[PDB]
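Prompt: Have a read of the protein record below and flag anything odd:
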Amino acid sequence: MAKERGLISPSDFAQLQKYMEYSTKKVSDVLKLFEDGEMAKYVQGDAIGYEGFQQFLKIYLEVDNVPRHLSLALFQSFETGHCLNETNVTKDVVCLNDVSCYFSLLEGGRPEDKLEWS
């Protein structure tokens, strides 16, 4: 596992790290929450918006308030929804499976199928 190529500094990883360090929950646990759970009230099919994502960090880190700073670097990590012929970047959703993968690395690393940005 010799990847890496410049990602969220040790500042964001530290926060989330130190955060999950004390926590023992699972991303797959919160995932279902947003799937069938109540958190699914702010999910658009298989993609969730930015705001709705906030709740994730809430339950995820079981925090009572997550920093927008990290939330910003959080979304930047993984996104989706663009076009080289459209000036409407409204209601931006993101794949959970994608975030679930990235996050899976934090806790450890659960492979299954890597993506490709050809």
In short: The CA atoms of residues 74 and 109 lie 17 Å apart. The first helix runs from residue 10 to 22. The first strand starts at residue 43 and ends at 44.
